[PDB]
């Protein structure tokens, strides 16, 4: 009853104010648990009313934070699960609900295996004495690299992300496992690119065009890789896949307080200058060489088929 309502609220405000939970895998787990509790703790008999209330609460979620697309695309995954179950039972009400629940359960148990799947897949993409470059921080990519390091020796060049220098803690984490790690400013990306073999980077969201929304500055790294023709690898699980297209959407970049870019102590100039701090940026699919997912490697030119396999095309608007 009101527990469900206040938990939905709590989650909405946690998504709105700050980043909670930090890992987007934990965010997917939390939103899936909440969707399960909603579909269990409501008086819905027909699948249509359930889908409608799910779409409404998902609209509220998406309005809470548009840049966090995992919640929305997993809501769409739940909607596709409901559609599949209704087609199975109609192409049956209690069995409907329990079958939806076991579908969500299998989705959740395969959710925690994507990390291990990518880690296992990592070995056949790294050779000895290779030079990797990565930008920012990504749990999936550091797991990739520290799993490849157990049987291979290679160098990782971590380009810090300004202003949020998450790349520093990533470099430290990689050095923990003895992965020879060079830390540099993002300004030195093109200067060092000539000596890099591969580029491995995570992402926040993959669009239907194949493009991906990743931390700012990664588009420049992709342009450098394309200039030097080095393969650019994206190790992104299959819950960051978003059916929306690049310019049919709104609110792509996430702008945070310019205090991160230019501090308050600069004084009077802060009334004359316009400071901008875009967290995310757009990378076209032409600059991506290969996508690594929990199922296996795939070219950017197959992400649309993955969409068709994951999301109903009438649910791309929620």
Where on the chain is the footprint of ligand C7B (CB under 6 A)?
129, 131, 155, 157, 182, 192, 195
Span from 22-30, 103-111, 228-236, 243-251 in contact with another protein (CB under 8 A): 243-251
Stretch that binds another protein, among 60-68, 150-158, 259-267, 301-309 (CB under 8 A): 301-309
> Cβ closer to ligand C7B: 201 or 279?
201
Output the smallest distance, CB 127 to ligand C7B, in A: 10
State which residue, 50 or 232, has the beta carbon closest to another protein. Answer: 232
Is residue 313 involved in binding another protein (CB under 8 A)? yes
- Applying CB under 8 A, the span of 28-36, 37-45, 256-264, 296-304 interacting with another protein comes to 296-304
State how far the Cα of 126 lies from the Cα of 149, in Å rounded to an integer. Answer: 9
| Residue 175 is a binding residue for another protein (CB under 8 A) | no
CB closer to ligand C7B, 92 vs 127: 127
Q: Which of 22, 123, 195, 245 binds another protein (CB under 8 A)?
A: 245
Q: Phi and psi (nearest 5°) for 75?
A: -60, -40
Query: Could you say which residues in the range 201-240 bind another protein, by CB under 8 A?
Result: 208-210
Q: How far apart are CA 280 and CA 203, in angstroms?
A: 10
Task: Considering only residues 275 through 294, tell me which ones interact with another protein, judged by CB under 8 A.
Answer: 285
For residues 91 and 313, which CB has a smaller minimum distance to another protein in the complex? 313
Q: Which of 142, 137, 277 is nearest to 214 (CA)?
A: 137
Nearer to ligand C7B by C-beta: 65 or 230? 230
């Amino acid at each position: 009853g009101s527990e469900l309502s206040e938990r939905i609220e709590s989650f909405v405000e946690t998504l709105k104010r700050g980043g909670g939970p930090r890992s987007s895998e934990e965010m997917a787990r939390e939103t899936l648990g909440l969707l399960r509790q909603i579909i269990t703790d409501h008086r819905w008999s027909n699948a249509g009313e359930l889908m409608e209330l799910i779409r409404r609460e998902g609209r509220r979620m998406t309005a809470a934070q548009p840049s966090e697309t995992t919640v929305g695309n997993m809501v769409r995954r739940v909607l596709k699960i409901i559609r599949e179950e209704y087609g199975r039972l109609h192409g049956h009400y209690a069995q409907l609900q329990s079958n939806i629940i076991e579908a969500i359960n299998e989705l959740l148990v395969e959710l925690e295996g994507t990390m291990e799947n990518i880690a296992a897949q990592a070995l056949e993409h790294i050779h000895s004495n290779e030079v990797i470059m990565t930008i920012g921080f990504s749990r999936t990519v550091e797991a990739f690299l520290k799993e490849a390091a157990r049987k291979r020796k290679f160098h990782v060049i971590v380009a810090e992300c300004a202003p949020f220098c998450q790349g520093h803690e990533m470099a430290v984490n990689l050095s923990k496992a003895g992965i020879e790690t060079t830390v540099m400013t993002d300004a030195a990306i093109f200067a060092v690119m000539s000596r890099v073999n591969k580029v491995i980077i995570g992402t926040k969201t993959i669009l239907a065009n194949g493009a991906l929304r990743a931390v700012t500055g990664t588009h420049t790294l992709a342009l450098a890789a394309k200039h030097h023709s080095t393969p650019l690898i994206v190790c992104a699980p299959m819950f960051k896949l978003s059916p929306q297209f690049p310019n049919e959407e709104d609110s792509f970049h996430k702008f945070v307080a310019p205090e991160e870019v230019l501090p308050f102590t600069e004084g009077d100039i802060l009334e004359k200058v316009s400071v901008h701090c875009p967290v995310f940026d757009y990378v076209p699919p032409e600059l991506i060489t290969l996508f690594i997912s929990n199922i296996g490697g795939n070219a950017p030119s197959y992400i649309y088929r993955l969409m068709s396999e994951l999301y109903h095309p009438d649910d791309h608007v929620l």
